[PDB]
Amino acid sequence: DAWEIPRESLRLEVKLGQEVWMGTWNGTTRVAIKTLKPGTMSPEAAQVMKKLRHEKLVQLYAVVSEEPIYIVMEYMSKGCLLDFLKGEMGKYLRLPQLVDMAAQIASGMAYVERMNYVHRDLRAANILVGENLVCKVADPIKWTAPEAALYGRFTIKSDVWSFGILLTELTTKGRVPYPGMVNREVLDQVERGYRMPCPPECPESLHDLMCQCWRKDPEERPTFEYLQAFLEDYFTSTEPQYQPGENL
Numbered sequence: 073d074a075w076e077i078p079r080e081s082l083r084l085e086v087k088l089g090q091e092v093w094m095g096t097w098n099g100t101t102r103v104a105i106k107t108l109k110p111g112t113m114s115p116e117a118a119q120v121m122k123k124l125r126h127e128k129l130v131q132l133y134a135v136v137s138e139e140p141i142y143i144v145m146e147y148m149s150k151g152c153l154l155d156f157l158k159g160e161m162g163k164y165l166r167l168p169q170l171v172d173m174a175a176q177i178a179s180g181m182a183y184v185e186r187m188n189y190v191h192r193d194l195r196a197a198n199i200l201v202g203e204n205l206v207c208k209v210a211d212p213i214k215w216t217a218p219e220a221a222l223y224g225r226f227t228i229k230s231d232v233w234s235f236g237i238l239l240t241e242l243t244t245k246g247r248v249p250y251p252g253m254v255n256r257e258v259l260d261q262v263e264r265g266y267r268m269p270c271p272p273e274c275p276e277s278l279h280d281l282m283c284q285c286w287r288k289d290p291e292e293r294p295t296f297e298y299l300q301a302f303l304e305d306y307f308t309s310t311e312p313q314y315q316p317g318e319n320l
């Protein structure tokens with residue numbers, strides 16, 4: 073019964089999803105308004121997001137319980153990261169900015185890890201970007217760990233698998249993993265121990281990190297806090313003699 077607000081207090085301005093809007097709350101604060109079909113399940117369907125609070129996670133500000141439904145949240149300047157990587161900023165990005173982006177989210181997930189939650193669909197489409205290349209965790213077998221796609225063993229260690237796949241999206245400016253292979257072909261070949269090669273111009277030492285997130289044994293995959301610290305320290309500890317190339 074807390075968080076609750078009057079419906080007059082939030083003006084919805086521009087559509088985004090299919091719904092989700094940009095607006096204003098108390099005629100001041102800029103906000104993202106995740107509507108509800110009244111519904112659609114609908115009051116099922118929030119407390120999940122009220123239980124979690126962190127800088128690299130997206131924030132719930134307030135709600136409307138009785139129908140029709142409304143949820144208000146932090147607005148992210150630059151939209152979802154998959155669109156940002158392929159589109160105009162795609163061609164200008166480089167390793168230094170790409171590894172910082174990757175570090176920030178590793179932070180988000182190290183909160184979720186510490187809090188004993190599990191996200192279950194970490195990937196570029198579900199990260200949001202803001203001003204100053206700020207990125208945050210928000211709200212498909214190719215991204216999904218084996219245990220999870222097959223047998224439903226979703227854990228924090230299935231999220232880190234998905235992370236390493238997200239590392240490949242950063243490195244190809246947002247290409248779908250496993251170029252030219254459909255989901256059934258991925259599933260069987262990955263069971264063989266196949267794992268994507270080193271992308272062009274991406275240094276071998278980062279490809280190793282990718283390969284460590286993708287181990288066939290969940291336990292052996294590293295923590296998010298290891299993952300954060302490693303990407304934080306990259307250009308001093310790992311590739312001190314890095315040199316700008318044509319894409320990276």
Ligand SMILES: C=CC(=O)Nc1ccc(Oc2nc(Nc3cc(C)[nH]n3)cc(N3CCN(C)CC3)n2)cc1
Pocket residue numbers: 088089090091092104106130145146147148149150151152200210211
């Ligand atoms: C049904 C939609 C869904 O599950 N997720 C979703 C929601 C929105 C979305 O697009 C989007 N969310 C935004 N900000 C948000 C969203 C939230 C929840 N906080 N801040 C901003 C945005 N832009 C796209 C193009 N830009 C030039 C203007 C801004 N798009 C893309 C995917």
